[PDB]
Design a protein around this ligand. Structure first.
Ligand SMILES: [Mg+2]
Ligand SMILES: [Mg+2]
Ligand SMILES: [Mg+2]
Ligand SMILES: [Mg+2]
Ligand SMILES: [Mg+2]
Ligand SMILES: [Mg+2]
Ligand SMILES: [Mg+2]
Ligand SMILES: [Mg+2]
Ligand SMILES: [Mg+2]
Ligand SMILES: [Mg+2]
Ligand SMILES: [Mg+2]
Ligand SMILES: [Mg+2]
Ligand SMILES: [Mg+2]
Ligand SMILES: [Mg+2]
Lengths: 128, 225, 125, 53, 147, 187
RNA sequence: CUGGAGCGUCGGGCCCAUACCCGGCCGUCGCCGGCAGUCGAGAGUGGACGGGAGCGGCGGGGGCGGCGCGCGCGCGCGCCCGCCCCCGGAGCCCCGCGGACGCUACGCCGCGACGAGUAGGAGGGCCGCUGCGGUGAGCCUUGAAGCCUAGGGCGCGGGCCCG
RNA sequence: UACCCACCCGACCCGUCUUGAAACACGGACCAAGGAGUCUAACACGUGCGCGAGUCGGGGGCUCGCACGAAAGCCGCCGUG
RNA sequence: AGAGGGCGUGAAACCGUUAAGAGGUAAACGGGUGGGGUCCGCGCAGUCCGCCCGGAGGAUUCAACCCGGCGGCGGGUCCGGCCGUGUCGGCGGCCCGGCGGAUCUUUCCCGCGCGGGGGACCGUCCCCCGACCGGCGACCGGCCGCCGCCGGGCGCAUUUCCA
């Protein structure tokens, strides 16, 4: 029963799946990472049928629900204590993410400050 | 001050409930020729064929002045002299339609694009359904919906055209301002013919769908509104 | 002038901070960490700030003087408020408004003060 | 291969500029090498117009 | 800088802003200003007309110092001399006319462009124009030569 | 299936100044302010110039601003220039003027003020006359730049006489295959 | 497969594309766009201020009507005379006395309209690598880089962020 | 969303030269690491900023053991061009 | 020592075995679901919170009011003074105000017609005071109006805390 949002809209995602690179499957030297294919002959790029789909714009996401975590609070990468008080007003629309490389002692310091002033933290219960 | 103003602005307020009544009334009684002419034009054509038939004798009704033209085929594999006409008729997209004023010049523009279009002399209920259901206007160069008729008056009030019904003389009867009536009017984008065509390719005359269909375009318009 | 400083300090600012699609401003007395004209501390010549009192309880309300700025030490004056939430806000409200002193912050200053107060009481079960 | 309006240009780099290029990162240390002469000569010839005859 | 170049935007871009039909081969035309008569002709003839050939007469060993001769236009003498030397006079009532060594300001010749203010002058110069003569005369004042 | 060319639907006008100079960006800001609002076309046009480039807001000479304000009717107005005023060493009876400019070269400054004129700036103008009432827009000659002589048809085409670009002019430096009719032909 | 599932000429009915319609959403261009603190929706002025007066008015077209009318001028109150008074208060859909939450003034908002692509261009890249000047009372032996992860996620994606 | 698996529809291997490639054309076993539009001079247009009938830049000078410095500052130089 | 003498880290191809699931159209791929797992959120009710209000319990001092103090804000009389913009006056700095000018005098002085210096002139920049005006974020003093804090008064149908 944590820190509810200001407003919880229906988040919709036009495609939920990743955009693998052509032949990232056969070859190990290819990372899944998109690289747009500029083959003269290549079937993908001539948007051919039942081939891998190409990442294009209009097949991107709603302005409101853009960038927005399943709960509602978009991240901030909070990185020490002082950076947390930035969200003190913008508490209820978006939350704290505590950076990977903060040391377990201040990883704690930040958390209980957050809860003090009611800012959600997505990894509150992490290093311990 | 306060209660010399209070009144002064309430007046303006009411001087409107005059005005937007007055006009509202005007429209309503305009709509009342727009019955009376609209009937009297029917009967007075029957009236007369009835008159002729009594003698051993014989009508030829007025040649049609109005013929909304539907484009019926797409836009690739298209000759030039055609494609230019089809974008003078504003039938750019496949299979929209416009209200065209027949006329030696216009008739003879349709000869030349015949194999791609389908026109006919449409009927009131056709004009209605079209202007009402699929009539947006061109306002600051924008397909904007005709929902209130302060949008028609706003472009055409200088031709004594003030309402959705005043448009609709100027679209049978041709009238003086066919031109400007039929050029705020933005080409009517019509859905696929429900129940389907006969043959996109050929003259109606040889069983197809193209060029002239006298009168019989009104089957076609029901199916495409 | 204000409007000018801004254009220097729009981007390029040490209390400015942009990660992760937000932008923000950690300066002393803006209210609500915004990057802005209205809600910025320094640029301008009259400024309301709201921040927690050093003791643990209450709210200090920082008001820029405008008697003589380019005088950082004294340019710029404070006051504690340890009361009972409602009067605490009514004080800030009456301090900003009916003192025609930047009646923009007006609400933000309240929202801050209100948010400060909730950060200081029996924290959690 | 010229294209549509320029000058002719006979840049003279058909020889071998590359080998015999003098760069000037002496310039400022030279400035100083010089300074110390102007300086020294004067202190040596003490009372005598530093500039010369 | 490297950062702000098209070559950055041409990676993954195979032929590199250069065409994969006819590649970027080394030196298709020739090398430099080469084929002026033959086949690059159409430039040289339409864009640099009058390149190919001799004309005129040699003057061989030549030195510019021999024929150094700058120009000034009447237009702006009433600059050369400090504007106060004009405001003094135009007034004064004796027909002073200040002297202007177009020499001393650096010009071996004075030429008749522009208006000249109605104001008598003594211009000492080298190689005067005719019109410069006439204008100065017709204003008032004189034309003195210098060697 | 719409059958328009998409070739030049996008218009190519400048819609912010390209510079980062805070003061231009401010008096630009000032008339996004006015030009939206007030009926006057003037401040649209001035807006539309603050906007434009150096090369394309050429400087006015003082002398040319004289013979554009000497004309009958134009007395008592303000000369207005989205650019710079410069001297004309070859002019002398400077009449008393009222000017606006982004810049005025320091020597023109002293010449105007000595005559008991005034100079304004693109803010004071906005208070003087926000609608542009009682003003005169002037620009320098945009077909001025020595560049513009290189422009046109070409040198070598028929009687269309256009500078060619030549490393150094002189006797031997383009006078031959195509200029003396004795030496091939001529155009 | 055979009065056929063959071939002529014809009906209805139905099936389906990335095509058209309506809607949804994400691009771009334009709107002489609005929005940097203001009235006002075929907008068809507003205001002094005087002299005179009042139920006057502006006693004009089957126009069907557009520019003049039936929510008021004057009036309720103070009592034929005065008023017709102040937002630090009218109580507010208009508010011009001061202005978004919204106004990173290269921010955000509404309209419409449109977004096949090799070569090429151009633009945009809080896309990515390494170096330095600034700056982040950045982070760090309470564990950095890398590395590893069928540990939650986010971007359309370069990648990015988290276990 | 990702792993395995299952099904239904779709479906030829990329790169390249190529009027036309899945090619009974050529490169290509796989993986790591390295790897290809760079610098300079000269033009030219476009644009940014300074000053403006000028404006500069050196090369020289005057001011450093440089920590920063082989910097910065300044010069009837400043115009000998 | 999962830093062991070619020893920091220690990837991929590649191979090592443990677990799960599959397996007649070579694998591998696109779209769509379904089953299962490893994990990940939870819930041993997730009934999510935040105002305001009414009711019933329980508890501190107030809020409304003045009075003493302190500190702001705003107003103006520009009242008084200080400040600067535009104008005028002082020709008053002008020699006790300089610097620029090929302006002018070798009536001057020094040094050798020239150089240096002095003296006259114009353009510039300072004092005196007087007058008008932008009276300007440039104050500072009094008078005011309002706000806030502190300290006094006000003991409880008030004003808070809690459930
Ligand atoms: Mg076809
Ligand atoms: Mg020497
Ligand atoms: Mg390409
Ligand atoms: Mg190639
Ligand atoms: Mg070829
Ligand atoms: Mg495209
Ligand atoms: Mg070949
Ligand atoms: Mg074959
Ligand atoms: Mg080969
Ligand atoms: Mg180890
Ligand atoms: Mg070590
Ligand atoms: Mg090891
Ligand atoms: Mg294994
Ligand atoms: Mg097994």
């Amino acid at each position: 029963a944590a820190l509810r949002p200001l407003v919880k809209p229906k988040i919709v995602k036009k495609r939920t799946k990743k955009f693998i690179r052509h032949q990232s499957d056969r070859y190990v030297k290819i990372k899944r990472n998109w690289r747009k294919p500029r083959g003269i002959d290549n079937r993908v790029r001539r948007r051919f049928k039942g081939q891998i789909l190409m990442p294009n714009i209009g097949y991107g996401s709603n302005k409101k629900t853009k960038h927005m975590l399943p709960s509602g609070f978009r991240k901030f990468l909070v990185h020490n204590v002082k950076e947390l008080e930035v969200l003190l007003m913008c508490n209820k629309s978006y939350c704290a993410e505590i950076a990977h490389n903060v040391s377990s002692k201040n990883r704690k310091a930040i958390v209980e400050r957050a809860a003090q002033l009611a800012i959600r933290v997505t990894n509150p219960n992490a290093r311990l | 001050n306060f209660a010399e103003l209070k009144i002064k602005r309430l007046r303006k307020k009411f001087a409107q409930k005059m005005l937007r009544k007055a006009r509202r009334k005007l429209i309503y009684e305009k709509a009342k020729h727009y019955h009376k002419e609209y009937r009297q034009m029917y009967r007075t054509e029957i009236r007369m064929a009835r008159m002729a038939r009594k003698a051993g004798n014989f009508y030829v009704p007025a040649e049609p002045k109005l013929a909304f033209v539907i484009r019926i085929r797409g836009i690739n594999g298209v000759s030039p002299k055609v494609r230019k006409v089809l974008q003078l008729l504003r039938l750019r997209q496949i299979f929209n339609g416009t209200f065209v004023k027949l006329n030696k010049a216009s008739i003879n523009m349709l000869r030349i694009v015949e194999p791609y279009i389908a026109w006919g002399y449409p009927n009131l209920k056709s004009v209605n359904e079209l202007i009402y259901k699929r009539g947006y206007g061109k306002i600051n160069k924008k397909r904007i919906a005709l929902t209130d008729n302060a949008l028609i008056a706003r472009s055409l009030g200088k031709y004594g055209i003030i309402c959705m019904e005043d448009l609709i003389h100027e679209i049978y009867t041709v009238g003086k301002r066919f031109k400007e009536a039929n050029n705020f009017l933005w080409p009517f984008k019509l859905s696929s013919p429900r129940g389907g065509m006969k043959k996109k390719t050929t003259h109606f005359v040889e069983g197809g769908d193209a060029g002239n269909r006298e009168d019989q375009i009104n089957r076609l318009i029901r199916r495409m509104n | 002038s204000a409007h000018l400083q801004w254009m220097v300090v729009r981007n390029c600012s040490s209390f400015l901070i942009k990660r992760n699609k937000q932008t923000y401003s950690t300066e002393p007395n803006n209210l609500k960490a915004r990057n802005s004209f209205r809600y910025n501390g320094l640029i301008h010549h009259k400024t309301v700030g709201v921040e927690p009192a050093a003791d643990g309880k209450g709210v200090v309300v920082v008001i820029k003087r405008r008697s003589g700025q380019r005088k950082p030490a004294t340019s710029y004056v404070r006051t504690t408020i340890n009361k009972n939430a409602r009067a605490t806000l009514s004080s800030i409200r009456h301090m900003i408004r009916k003192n025609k002193y930047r009646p923009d912050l007006r609400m933000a200053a309240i929202r801050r003060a209100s948010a400060i107060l909730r950060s200081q009481k029996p924290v959690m079960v | 291969a010229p294209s549509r309006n320029g000058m002719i240009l006979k840049p003279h780099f058909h020889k071998d500029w590359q080998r015999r290029v003098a760069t000037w990162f002496n310039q400022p240390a030279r400035k100083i090498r010089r300074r110390k002469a102007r300086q020294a000569k004067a202190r040596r010839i003490a009372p005598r117009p530093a500039s010369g005859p | 800088p490297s950062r702000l170049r098209k070559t950055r935007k041409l990676r993954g871009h195979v032929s590199h802003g250069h065409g994969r039909i006819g590649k970027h081969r080394k030196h298709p035309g020739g090398r430099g200003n080469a084929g002026g008569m033959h086949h690059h002709r159409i430039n040289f003839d339409k864009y640099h007309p009058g390149y190919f050939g001799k004309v005129g007469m040699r003057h061989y060993h030549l030195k510019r110092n021999q024929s150094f001769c700058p120009t000034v236009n009447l237009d702006k003498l009433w600059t050369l001399v400090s504007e106060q030397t004009r405001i003094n006079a135009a007034k004064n009532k004796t027909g002073a006319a200040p002297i202007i060594d177009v020499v001393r300001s650096g010009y071996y010749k004075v030429l008749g462009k522009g208006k000249l203010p109605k104001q008598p002058v003594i211009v000492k110069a080298k190689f005067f124009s005719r019109r410069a003569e006439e204008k100065i005369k017709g204003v008032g004042g004189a034309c003195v030569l210098v060697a | 299936g719409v059958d328009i060319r998409h070739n030049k639907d996008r218009k190519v006008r400048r819609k912010e100044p390209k510079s980062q100079d805070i003061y231009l960006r401010l008096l630009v800001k000032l008339y996004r302010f006015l030009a939206r609002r007030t009926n006057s076309t003037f401040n649209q046009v001035v807006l539309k110039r603050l906007f434009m480039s150096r090369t394309n807001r050429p400087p006015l000479s003082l002398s040319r601003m004289i013979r554009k304000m000497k004309l009958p009717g134009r007395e008592g107005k303000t000369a207005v220039v989205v650019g710079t005023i410069t001297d004309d060493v070859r002019v002398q009876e400077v009449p008393k003027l009222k000017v606006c400019a982004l810049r005025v070269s320091s020597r023109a400054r002293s010449r105007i003020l000595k005559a008991g004129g005034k100079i304004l700036t693109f803010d004071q103008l906005a208070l003087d006359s926000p609608k542009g009432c009682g003003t005169v827009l002037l620009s320098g000659p945009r077909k001025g730049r020595e560049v513009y002589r290189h422009f046109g048809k070409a040198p070598g085409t028929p009687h269309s006489h256009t500078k060619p670009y030549v490393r150094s002019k002189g006797r031997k430096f383009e006078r031959a295959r195509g200029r003396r009719a004795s030496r091939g032909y001529k155009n």
